[PDB]
């Protein structure tokens, strides 16, 4: 929604990032934005709403952090996830302009954006900027239990964001990379700035399309489901956006059905709720038709 010098939610996010030992530049501030919003949607707007030892207790804070991140994942998967993602991306971009050394007539070193002044940034450009910077310094190949799970919550967020918004269509197409200068691509791959699963630079390619729910939010009734149906849908979107085939229903655990229609399928999430989708086999796109109670 909104966040309340720097906002208290970002100061708290800074304490959380430190005590969970993520590692203080723009990749850190991008993650600070994300965790600030996870706090916001969880109703944390004062330090007095946290345990007094939140800044010093890795084990306790890791637990509440993961709860907060899951609340944010649900918000992204809900009716308003697209605008929420754009709000967060704009929050990030605005704060690099006012509290950072960046001008309106200035560029960032981002793939598919190196020649674009910041004033001309569309909402999707801001999504790409938040995505790109947040993804850096972030271990997909983590090490220790509980630690790893903390870093993985940021993976989930970014991937879902790419699925809930139009961003995943941009970054997971081939023209995103072959449309760059070869020198640009070179330093991007060499400095590991295009790590997987965040990017798919040359050397499967499935992705999720939630366009039908952006154009018609009444098709998304994700919020009416129980937590277990929500977590199954979250995992389903996550797996396909990592590039795996839509038969990721295998994350009685699998309920893959085929409905009446050209390549129209469904997965039961609960006895009342389901997710409905089509499968474009040639373009490697799974298009969500509804989530929640069934559309009429």
Residue 271, C-beta contacts closer than 8 angstroms, at least 6 positions apart = none
**C-beta of residue 275 within 8 angstroms of C-beta of residue 264:** no
Query: What is the rounded distance in angstroms from the CA atom of residue 46 to the CA atom of residue 30?
Result: 21
Asked whether the beta carbons of 142 and 215 are under 8 A apart, the reply is no
> What tokens does 249 get?
């229903």
Cβ distance 121 to 106 under 8 Å?
A: no
Of the candidates 258, 256, 260, the one whose C-alpha atom is nearest the C-alpha of residue 268 is 256
Q: Are the CB atoms for 4 and 48 separated by under 8 Å?
A: no
CATH architecture observed for domain 207-292: 2-Layer Sandwich (3.30)
CA-angle at 171, arms to 183 and 281, nearest 5°: 125
Answer positive or negative: Cα dihedral of 123, 291, 197, 285.
negative
Which uninterrupted H or E stretch holds 291? strand 285-292
Angle at 175 between CA 138 and CA 77, to 5 degrees: 50
Orientation angle between helical segments 81-98 and 58-77, nearest 10 degrees = 120
Distance, CA of 75 to CA of 17 (rounded, Å): 21
End-to-end C-alpha distance for the chain, whole angstroms: 30
Resolution value in angstroms: 2.1
Q: Of 149, 176, 180, 168, whose CA–CA distance to 58 is shortest? A: 149
Bridge partners of 280, per DSSP, are: 285
CB-CB neighbours of 178 under 10 Å = 11
Sequence-separated contacts (24+) of 257-266 with Cβ below 8 Å: 264/289
Q: Where are the beta strands (DSSP E) in 172-283?
A: 207-209, 256-258, 264-268, 274-280
- Enumerate residues 6+ apart whose C-beta is below 8 A from 25: none
Domain boundaries, the chain: 8-190, 207-292
Give alpha helix (H) positions in the chain. 8-19, 26-41, 58-77, 81-98, 123-135, 147-164, 167-171, 175-178, 182-190, 211-215, 227-241
Question: Could you tell me the CA-to-CA distances from 279 to 46, 186, 247 in Å, in that order?
Answer: 45, 34, 10
Q: Measured at the alpha carbon of residue 183, what is the angle toward residues 182 and 188, in degrees to the nearest 5? A: 95
Tokens of 102: 């960046």
User: What is the SS3 assignment for 290?
Assistant: strand
Structure tokens at 253: 């655990």
Distance CA 126, CA 92 (A): 8
Short-list 225, 222, 221, 207, CA closest to 166: 207
- What are 241's strand-pairing partners? none
């Amino acid at each position: 929604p909104v966040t309340t010098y720097q906002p208290v939610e970002k100061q708290i996010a800074g304490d959380i990032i430190r005590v969970l030992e993520f590692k203080y530049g723009i990749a850190y501030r991008a993650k600070k934005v994300i965790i600030a919003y996870a706090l916001a949607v969880s109703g944390i707007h004062n330090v007095s709403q946290l345990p007094e030892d939140y800044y010093k207790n890795k084990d306790n804070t890791g637990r509440i952090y993961q709860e907060y991140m899951s609340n944010l994942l649900s918000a992204l998967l809900g009716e308003n996830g697209d605008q929420i993602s754009k709000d967060m991306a704009n929050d990030f971009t605005q704060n690099e302009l006012e509290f950072g050394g960046q001008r309106l007539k200035n560029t960032w070193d981002i793939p598919d954006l190196e020649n674009k002044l910041l004033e001309d940034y569309s909402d999707e450009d801001k999504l790409l900027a938040l995505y790109f910077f947040a993804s850096q310094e972030l271990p997909m190949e983590a090490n220790q239990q509980s630690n790893a799970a903390n870093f993985f919550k940021v993976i989930d967020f970014l991937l879902i964001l790419s699925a809930v918004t139009s961003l995943g269509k941009r970054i997971f197409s081939k023209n995103f990379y072959n449309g760059l200068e070869t020198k640009s691509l070179e330093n991007y791959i060499e400095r590991k700035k295009l790590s997987k699963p965040f990017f798919r630079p040359p050397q499967s390619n499935w992705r999720v399309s939630l366009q039908k729910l952006r154009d018609n939010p009444s098709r998304n009734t994700f919020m009416k489901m129980d937590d277990a149906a929500k977590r199954k849908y979250s995992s389903f979107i996550k797996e396909v956006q990592k590039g795996n085939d839509p038969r990721a229903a295998a994350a009685s655990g699998s309920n893959f059905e085929k409905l009446q229609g050209r390549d129209l399928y469904s997965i039961r999430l609960s006895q009342e709720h389901r997710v409905t989708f089509s499968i474009n086999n040639t373009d490697q796109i799974m298009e969500i038709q509804s989530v929640g109670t069934h559309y009429q």
